[PDB]
Design an enzyme around this catalytic site. Structure first.
Site, PDB file in Angstrom:
ATOM      1  N   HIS A  10      58.124  23.267 -25.699  1.00  0.00           N
ATOM      2  CA  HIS A  10      58.692  24.569 -25.374  1.00  0.00           C
ATOM      3  C   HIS A  10      59.974  24.434 -24.554  1.00  0.00           C
ATOM      4  O   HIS A  10      60.912  25.232 -24.702  1.00  0.00           O
ATOM      5  CB  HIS A  10      57.650  25.375 -24.602  1.00  0.00           C
ATOM      6  CG  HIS A  10      58.189  26.599 -23.936  1.00  0.00           C
ATOM      7  ND1 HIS A  10      58.339  27.798 -24.599  1.00  0.00           N
ATOM      8  CD2 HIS A  10      58.610  26.816 -22.665  1.00  0.00           C
ATOM      9  CE1 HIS A  10      58.826  28.703 -23.768  1.00  0.00           C
ATOM     10  NE2 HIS A  10      58.999  28.134 -22.586  1.00  0.00           N
ATOM     11  N   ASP A  26      58.975  32.810 -15.510  1.00  0.00           N
ATOM     12  CA  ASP A  26      57.543  33.055 -15.479  1.00  0.00           C
ATOM     13  C   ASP A  26      56.796  31.916 -14.794  1.00  0.00           C
ATOM     14  O   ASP A  26      55.584  32.029 -14.592  1.00  0.00           O
ATOM     15  CB  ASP A  26      56.995  33.313 -16.899  1.00  0.00           C
ATOM     16  CG  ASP A  26      57.242  32.188 -17.901  1.00  0.00           C
ATOM     17  OD1 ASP A  26      58.161  31.374 -17.764  1.00  0.00           O
ATOM     18  OD2 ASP A  26      56.479  32.174 -18.882  1.00  0.00           O
ATOM     19  N   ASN A  70      59.840  32.341 -27.397  1.00  0.00           N
ATOM     20  CA  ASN A  70      61.149  31.993 -26.850  1.00  0.00           C
ATOM     21  C   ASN A  70      61.375  30.503 -27.059  1.00  0.00           C
ATOM     22  O   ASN A  70      60.815  29.675 -26.333  1.00  0.00           O
ATOM     23  CB  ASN A  70      61.216  32.357 -25.370  1.00  0.00           C
ATOM     24  CG  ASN A  70      62.515  31.907 -24.709  1.00  0.00           C
ATOM     25  OD1 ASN A  70      63.456  31.477 -25.386  1.00  0.00           O
ATOM     26  ND2 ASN A  70      62.576  32.015 -23.377  1.00  0.00           N
ATOM     27  N   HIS A  90      61.506  28.112 -16.320  1.00  0.00           N
ATOM     28  CA  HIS A  90      61.687  29.526 -16.652  1.00  0.00           C
ATOM     29  C   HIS A  90      61.099  30.433 -15.553  1.00  0.00           C
ATOM     30  O   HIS A  90      60.266  30.019 -14.722  1.00  0.00           O
ATOM     31  CB  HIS A  90      61.062  29.839 -18.020  1.00  0.00           C
ATOM     32  CG  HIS A  90      61.809  29.262 -19.177  1.00  0.00           C
ATOM     33  ND1 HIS A  90      61.241  29.098 -20.425  1.00  0.00           N
ATOM     34  CD2 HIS A  90      63.098  28.864 -19.287  1.00  0.00           C
ATOM     35  CE1 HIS A  90      62.151  28.610 -21.249  1.00  0.00           C
ATOM     36  NE2 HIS A  90      63.281  28.456 -20.586  1.00  0.00           N
ATOM     37  N   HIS A  97      57.422  24.561 -15.705  1.00  0.00           N
ATOM     38  CA  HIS A  97      58.784  24.375 -16.224  1.00  0.00           C
ATOM     39  C   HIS A  97      59.683  25.367 -15.492  1.00  0.00           C
ATOM     40  O   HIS A  97      59.247  26.054 -14.567  1.00  0.00           O
ATOM     41  CB  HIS A  97      58.887  24.468 -17.771  1.00  0.00           C
ATOM     42  CG  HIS A  97      58.600  25.809 -18.379  1.00  0.00           C
ATOM     43  ND1 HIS A  97      57.317  26.245 -18.663  1.00  0.00           N
ATOM     44  CD2 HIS A  97      59.431  26.760 -18.878  1.00  0.00           C
ATOM     45  CE1 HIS A  97      57.373  27.426 -19.249  1.00  0.00           C
ATOM     46  NE2 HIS A  97      58.642  27.762 -19.393  1.00  0.00           N
TER      47      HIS A  97
HETATM   48  C1  LIG Z   1      60.429  34.419 -19.793  1.00  0.00           C
HETATM   49  C2  LIG Z   1      59.352  33.671 -20.584  1.00  0.00           C
HETATM   50  C3  LIG Z   1      59.691  32.187 -20.502  1.00  0.00           C
HETATM   51  S1  LIG Z   1      58.494  31.171 -21.408  1.00  0.00           S
HETATM   52  C4  LIG Z   1      59.415  34.241 -21.997  1.00  0.00           C
HETATM   53  O1  LIG Z   1      60.202  33.831 -22.788  1.00  0.00           O
HETATM   54  N1  LIG Z   1      58.510  35.325 -22.343  1.00  0.00           N
HETATM   55  C5  LIG Z   1      58.551  35.922 -23.670  1.00  0.00           C
HETATM   56  B1  LIG Z   1      57.521  35.237 -24.628  1.00  0.00           B
HETATM   57  O2  LIG Z   1      57.863  35.142 -25.926  1.00  0.00           O
HETATM   58  O3  LIG Z   1      56.215  35.276 -24.313  1.00  0.00           O
HETATM   59 ZN   LIG Z   2      59.294  29.111 -20.813  1.00  0.00          ZN
HETATM   60 ZN   LIG Z   3      56.406  31.345 -20.710  1.00  0.00          ZN
END
Ligand SMILES: C[C@H](CS)C(=O)NCB(O)O
Ligand SMILES: [Zn+2]
Ligand SMILES: [Zn+2]
Length: 231
Positions: free
Chosen positions: A148, A87, A179, A85, A83
């Site tokens: 998500h 990460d 998140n 984001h 996706h």
């Molecule tokens: C940046 C990444 C995108 S899925 C994130 O929100 N990490 C915090 B989490 O709650 O693990």
């Molecule tokens: Zn994410």
């Molecule tokens: Zn993530």
């Protein structure tokens, strides 16, 4: 033992052997004042490697490539981001500079651009509607529907019965929503039903963050998501 967040300094990457030719990669990154662990996948693709997701940033993704070279020694030639984001796409420019052909759905690529994130080069075809699946080398890519995020993909390795859920699947110890800024909370349980329908034989299930488990993580995630909805 699977490595935990406190065991991995930001900038280091661990590899974990899940099955023959299947590894997860584990990194850590600061986000909104805390440090989080994050998983991706590595799958042997003949004499090459297929990477699923970056290691959450340029520096981490460089460390990932270095650990792969040190421990596995085959070249990463393709990457899929599951996706938009950071990460998942943060580090795509490093991958591209290293010779990796980077891929994501057209939706992921557009969403990444709007967010100011790095953009995988190539568009994946055939993943536009909930339930769509395509083969990509040694894996199947599956779009379960919005969860998500609206664009989130999951990945199955048939040879090893490994289901990589990415951030649509929570680890068992997570009891509150993560998140969910970009989530579709109403659809997420149904999207998990689609994953269960398609991959009932999965033996290992890897969440986007935290410890692997089994298909129990699917029902667990549904429980967490619904409870957040009833709040
Ligand atoms: C940046 C990444 C995108 S899925 C994130 O929100 N990490 C915090 B989490 O709650 O693990
Ligand atoms: Zn994410
Ligand atoms: Zn993530």
């Amino acid at each position: 033992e699977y490595p935990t967040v406190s065991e991995i300094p930001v900038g280091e990457v661990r590899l974990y052997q899940i099955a023959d030719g299947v590894w997860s990669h584990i990194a850590t990154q600061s986000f909104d004042g805390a440090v989080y662990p994050s998983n991706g996948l590595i799958v042997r693709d003949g004499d090459e490697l297929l990477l699923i997701d970056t290691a959450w940033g340029a520096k981490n993704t460089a460390a990932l490539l270095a650990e792969i070279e040190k421990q596995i020694g085959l070249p990463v030639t393709r990457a899929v981001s599951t996706h938009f984001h950071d990460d998942r796409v943060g580090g795509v420019d490093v991958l591209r500079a290293a010779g990796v052909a980077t891929y994501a759905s057209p939706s992921t690529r557009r969403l990444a651009e709007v967010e100011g994130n790095e953009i995988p080069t190539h568009s994946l075809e055939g993943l536009s509607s909930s339930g769509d699946a395509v083969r990509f080398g040694p894996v199947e890519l599956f779009y379960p529907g919005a969860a998500h995020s609206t664009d989130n993909l999951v990945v199955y390795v048939p040879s090893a019965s490994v289901l990589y859920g990415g951030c649509a699947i929570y680890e068992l110890s997570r009891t509150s929503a993560g998140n969910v800024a970009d989530a579709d909370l109403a659809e997420w349980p149904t999207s998990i039903e689609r994953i269960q329908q398609h991959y009932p034989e999965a033996q290992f299930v890897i969440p986007g963050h935290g410890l692997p488990g089994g298909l129990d993580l699917l029902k667990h995630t549904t429980n967490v998501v619904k409870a957040h909805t009833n709040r």
